[PDB]
Amino acid sequence: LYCQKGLSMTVEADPANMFNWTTEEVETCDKGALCQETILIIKAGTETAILATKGCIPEGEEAITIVQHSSPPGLIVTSYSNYCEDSFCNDKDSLSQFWEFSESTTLHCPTCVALGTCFSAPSLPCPNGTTRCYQGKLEITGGGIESSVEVKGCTAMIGCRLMSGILAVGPMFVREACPH
Ligand SMILES: *[C@@H]1O[C@H](CO)[C@@H](O)[C@H](O)[C@H]1NC(C)=O
Ligand SMILES: [Pt+2]
Ligand SMILES: [Pt+2]
Ligand SMILES: [Pt+2]
Known part of the structure; x- marks a missing residue:
């Protein structure tokens, strides 16, 4: 078995698609072994953090x-993970399917996403339906990904649940914590 291999952690001002x-x-x-391709996409305002890993993994379904x-x-x-058992099967090239990344009461919330810590997080007008401000950090390990991601923005979600408690993302483990 042979697998596409690569690792990428970026913040893009350009869309995921x-x-x-x-x-x-x-x-x-x-x-x-299996082939895996796993990607975690985090959009705050106009910036998108993309954590992407391809390679062999010794065990999985x-x-x-x-x-x-x-x-929204x-x-x-959003995350995508493909664990596949034919050589070169981990061949995804596009995220165009994830159109969530293509776009009374106004909240203004500190907004940023960064590898490590945000340089700055200006308070920006939030999309309609926002009810609160989120601040958090994601500690990510596994699949050759080792990073902290700081995230601040607008949400209607309750509590520190950016990941919705889904902390296993292919071979990555994502620990989410918020200020208080
Ligand atoms: C924003 O949300 C409310 C509640 O659904 C809606 O009635 C209101 O018209 C919306 N405002 C704008 C600017 O569209
Ligand atoms: Pt392996
Ligand atoms: Pt699909
Ligand atoms: Pt936002």
């Missing part, structure tokens, strides 16, 4: 798993 999940490299799996962790209005978090 122009991200190219290109991988040049391939790698050889131990026997009984063949499955495609799409999770809409947070839906406001902060949007």
Whole structure:
């Protein structure tokens, strides 16, 4: 078994539906391994953090798993994970299917997303249906991803639940914590 191999952690001012999940490299799996491609997409205002991993994983169930962790209005978090058992099967290139990333009471909320800590988080007018401000940090380990992501923005979600308690995202483990 051979798998597309690549690792990418970026914050884009450009939409997710122009991200190219290109991988040049391939790698050889131990026997009984799977191919995985896993991506976590976090949009705050006009910026999108994209944490993406492709390679062999020694064990797992063949499955495609799409999770809409947070839906509009406001902060949007989607993950896609494909665990597949044919050589080169982890070949996804486009995120165009995730149109959540293509777009009375007004909330103004500090807005940012950053690898590490946000340089700045200006308070911006929130999309209609927002009821509160979110501030959190995601500590991510697994699949060769090691990062903290700071996230502030607009939401109608209750509590510290940007990930909706779905903390396993293919081989990544995402620990979500908020200020108080
Ligand atoms: C915003 O939300 C409310 C509640 O659904 C709606 O009635 C109101 O007209 C909306 N405001 C705008 C600017 O569309
Ligand atoms: Pt392996
Ligand atoms: Pt699909
Ligand atoms: Pt937002």
